[PDB]
Design a protein around this ligand. Sequence first.
Ligand SMILES: [Ca+2]
Ligand SMILES: [Ca+2]
Ligand SMILES: [Ca+2]
Ligand SMILES: [Ca+2]
Ligand SMILES: [Ca+2]
Ligand SMILES: [Ca+2]
Ligand SMILES: [Ca+2]
Ligand SMILES: [Ca+2]
Length: 177
Amino acid sequence: MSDEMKKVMEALKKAVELAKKNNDDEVAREIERAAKEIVEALRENNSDEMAKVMLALAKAVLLAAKNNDDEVAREIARAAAEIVEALRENNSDEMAKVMLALAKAVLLAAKNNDDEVAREIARAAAEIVEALRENNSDEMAKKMLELAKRVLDAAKNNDDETAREIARQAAEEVEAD
Ligand SMILES: [Ca+2]
Ligand SMILES: [Ca+2]
Ligand SMILES: [Ca+2]
Ligand SMILES: [Ca+2]
Ligand SMILES: [Ca+2]
Ligand SMILES: [Ca+2]
Ligand SMILES: [Ca+2]
Ligand SMILES: [Ca+2]
Protein backbone atom coordinates (compact mmCIF):
# COMPACT_ATOMS: atom_id res chain seq x y z
CA MET A 1 0.00 0.00 0.00
CA SER A 2 1.32 3.39 -1.14
CA ASP A 3 1.46 6.52 1.00
CA GLU A 4 -1.19 8.25 -1.12
CA MET A 5 -3.40 5.20 -0.56
CA LYS A 6 -2.71 5.21 3.19
CA LYS A 7 -3.96 8.82 3.29
CA VAL A 8 -7.16 8.00 1.41
CA MET A 9 -7.82 4.99 3.67
CA GLU A 10 -7.44 7.09 6.81
CA ALA A 11 -9.97 9.49 5.26
CA LEU A 12 -12.31 6.56 4.59
CA LYS A 13 -12.01 5.52 8.23
CA LYS A 14 -13.01 9.10 9.14
CA ALA A 15 -15.92 8.95 6.70
CA VAL A 16 -17.21 5.79 8.38
CA GLU A 17 -17.00 7.41 11.79
CA LEU A 18 -18.80 10.51 10.53
CA ALA A 19 -21.51 8.36 8.96
CA LYS A 20 -21.99 6.58 12.28
CA LYS A 21 -22.12 9.92 14.13
CA ASN A 22 -25.04 11.00 11.93
CA ASN A 23 -26.93 7.68 12.50
CA ASP A 24 -26.24 6.64 8.88
CA ASP A 25 -25.35 3.10 9.95
CA GLU A 26 -26.08 1.38 6.62
CA VAL A 27 -23.95 3.91 4.73
CA ALA A 28 -21.14 3.35 7.20
CA ARG A 29 -21.38 -0.41 6.72
CA GLU A 30 -21.09 -0.17 2.97
CA ILE A 31 -18.15 2.24 3.06
CA GLU A 32 -16.44 -0.10 5.49
CA ARG A 33 -17.17 -3.13 3.26
CA ALA A 34 -15.64 -1.39 0.24
CA ALA A 35 -12.60 -0.23 2.21
CA LYS A 36 -12.08 -3.75 3.58
CA GLU A 37 -12.31 -5.32 0.12
CA ILE A 38 -9.71 -2.85 -1.20
CA VAL A 39 -7.30 -3.63 1.64
CA GLU A 40 -7.52 -7.40 1.04
CA ALA A 41 -7.09 -6.92 -2.74
CA LEU A 42 -3.88 -4.94 -2.12
CA ARG A 43 -2.55 -7.44 0.46
CA GLU A 44 -2.48 -10.26 -2.08
CA ASN A 45 -1.61 -8.39 -5.27
CA ASN A 46 1.32 -6.04 -5.97
CA SER A 47 0.21 -5.23 -9.52
CA ASP A 48 0.51 -1.48 -10.21
CA GLU A 49 -2.54 -1.61 -12.42
CA MET A 50 -4.38 -3.06 -9.39
CA ALA A 51 -3.11 -0.22 -7.21
CA LYS A 52 -4.35 2.28 -9.81
CA VAL A 53 -7.89 0.92 -9.81
CA MET A 54 -7.97 0.69 -6.02
CA LEU A 55 -6.90 4.33 -5.59
CA ALA A 56 -9.57 5.56 -7.96
CA LEU A 57 -12.23 3.50 -6.13
CA ALA A 58 -11.15 4.66 -2.68
CA LYS A 59 -11.36 8.30 -3.81
CA ALA A 60 -14.75 7.72 -5.41
CA VAL A 61 -16.26 6.33 -2.22
CA LEU A 62 -14.78 9.18 -0.18
CA LEU A 63 -16.12 11.86 -2.52
CA ALA A 64 -19.54 10.25 -2.73
CA ALA A 65 -19.77 10.09 1.04
CA LYS A 66 -19.02 13.82 1.08
CA ASN A 67 -20.96 14.98 -1.98
CA ASN A 68 -23.98 12.75 -2.47
CA ASP A 69 -27.26 11.79 -0.81
CA ASP A 70 -26.99 8.89 1.69
CA GLU A 71 -28.73 6.48 -0.60
CA VAL A 72 -26.59 7.45 -3.61
CA ALA A 73 -23.47 7.18 -1.45
CA ARG A 74 -24.50 3.61 -0.64
CA GLU A 75 -24.74 2.74 -4.34
CA ILE A 76 -21.29 4.09 -5.15
CA ALA A 77 -19.82 2.23 -2.16
CA ARG A 78 -21.57 -0.96 -3.28
CA ALA A 79 -20.36 -0.53 -6.86
CA ALA A 80 -16.83 -0.05 -5.59
CA ALA A 81 -16.93 -3.16 -3.39
CA GLU A 82 -18.38 -5.29 -6.22
CA ILE A 83 -15.71 -3.98 -8.65
CA VAL A 84 -13.03 -5.09 -6.21
CA GLU A 85 -14.72 -8.50 -5.72
CA ALA A 86 -14.72 -9.01 -9.52
CA LEU A 87 -11.07 -8.07 -9.80
CA ARG A 88 -10.12 -10.42 -7.03
CA GLU A 89 -11.73 -13.23 -9.04
CA ASN A 90 -9.93 -12.29 -12.26
CA ASN A 91 -7.40 -9.45 -12.75
CA SER A 92 -6.31 -10.24 -16.29
CA ASP A 93 -5.04 -7.20 -18.20
CA GLU A 94 -8.43 -6.94 -19.95
CA MET A 95 -10.38 -7.16 -16.66
CA ALA A 96 -8.21 -4.44 -15.15
CA LYS A 97 -8.93 -2.18 -18.13
CA VAL A 98 -12.67 -2.60 -17.67
CA MET A 99 -12.46 -1.93 -13.98
CA LEU A 100 -10.15 1.07 -14.36
CA ALA A 101 -12.67 2.66 -16.74
CA LEU A 102 -15.51 1.99 -14.31
CA ALA A 103 -13.50 3.27 -11.32
CA LYS A 104 -12.73 6.46 -13.23
CA ALA A 105 -16.42 6.85 -14.09
CA VAL A 106 -17.75 6.47 -10.54
CA LEU A 107 -15.01 8.87 -9.35
CA LEU A 108 -15.99 11.53 -11.87
CA ALA A 109 -19.68 10.99 -11.12
CA ALA A 110 -19.01 11.36 -7.37
CA LYS A 111 -16.96 14.49 -8.11
CA ASN A 112 -19.56 16.17 -10.31
CA ASN A 113 -22.03 16.50 -7.41
CA ASP A 114 -25.11 15.26 -9.37
CA ASP A 115 -27.11 12.60 -7.43
CA GLU A 116 -29.06 11.23 -10.42
CA VAL A 117 -25.95 10.83 -12.56
CA ALA A 118 -23.98 9.32 -9.69
CA ARG A 119 -26.75 6.78 -9.11
CA GLU A 120 -27.05 5.78 -12.77
CA ILE A 121 -23.27 5.56 -13.38
CA ALA A 122 -22.91 3.32 -10.31
CA ARG A 123 -25.75 1.11 -11.56
CA ALA A 124 -24.28 0.79 -15.05
CA ALA A 125 -20.91 -0.17 -13.52
CA ALA A 126 -22.69 -2.71 -11.34
CA GLU A 127 -24.42 -4.29 -14.32
CA ILE A 128 -21.15 -4.63 -16.21
CA VAL A 129 -19.44 -6.16 -13.15
CA GLU A 130 -22.30 -8.63 -12.68
CA ALA A 131 -21.98 -9.71 -16.32
CA LEU A 132 -18.28 -10.35 -15.99
CA ARG A 133 -18.70 -12.40 -12.81
CA GLU A 134 -21.10 -14.65 -14.71
CA ASN A 135 -18.60 -14.93 -17.57
CA ASN A 136 -15.17 -13.25 -17.53
CA SER A 137 -13.88 -14.81 -20.73
CA ASP A 138 -11.52 -12.76 -22.89
CA GLU A 139 -14.44 -12.26 -25.30
CA MET A 140 -16.92 -11.05 -22.69
CA ALA A 141 -14.28 -8.75 -21.19
CA LYS A 142 -13.65 -7.10 -24.56
CA LYS A 143 -17.37 -6.44 -24.99
CA MET A 144 -17.68 -5.05 -21.48
CA LEU A 145 -14.63 -2.81 -22.04
CA GLU A 146 -16.45 -0.99 -24.82
CA LEU A 147 -19.46 -0.49 -22.55
CA ALA A 148 -17.26 0.67 -19.66
CA LYS A 149 -15.63 3.23 -21.93
CA ARG A 150 -19.13 4.52 -22.71
CA VAL A 151 -20.01 4.74 -19.00
CA LEU A 152 -16.93 6.90 -18.46
CA ASP A 153 -17.94 9.14 -21.38
CA ALA A 154 -21.46 9.40 -19.90
CA ALA A 155 -20.01 10.49 -16.58
CA LYS A 156 -17.91 13.07 -18.44
CA ASN A 157 -21.06 14.37 -20.13
CA ASN A 158 -23.17 14.25 -16.93
CA ASP A 159 -25.57 12.09 -18.95
CA ASP A 160 -27.87 9.98 -16.75
CA GLU A 161 -30.10 8.91 -19.65
CA THR A 162 -27.16 7.37 -21.52
CA ALA A 163 -25.92 5.70 -18.33
CA ARG A 164 -29.28 3.93 -17.96
CA GLU A 165 -29.14 2.74 -21.58
CA ILE A 166 -25.68 1.24 -21.07
CA ALA A 167 -26.96 -0.58 -17.97
CA ARG A 168 -29.78 -2.14 -19.99
CA GLN A 169 -27.42 -3.16 -22.80
CA ALA A 170 -25.03 -4.77 -20.31
CA ALA A 171 -27.91 -6.76 -18.76
CA GLU A 172 -29.07 -7.84 -22.24
CA GLU A 173 -25.58 -8.83 -23.43
CA VAL A 174 -25.58 -11.22 -20.47
CA GLU A 175 -28.85 -12.60 -21.76
CA ALA A 176 -27.34 -13.01 -25.24
CA ASP A 177 -24.30 -14.79 -23.83
CA1 LIG B 1 -26.98 14.63 13.81
CA1 LIG C 1 -28.01 11.07 6.71
CA1 LIG D 1 -24.39 1.13 14.62
CA1 LIG E 1 0.43 -4.56 -16.88
CA1 LIG F 1 -24.28 17.26 -3.06
CA1 LIG G 1 -7.46 -13.53 -7.70
CA1 LIG H 1 -30.44 14.37 -17.81
CA1 LIG I 1 -34.65 -9.29 -22.08
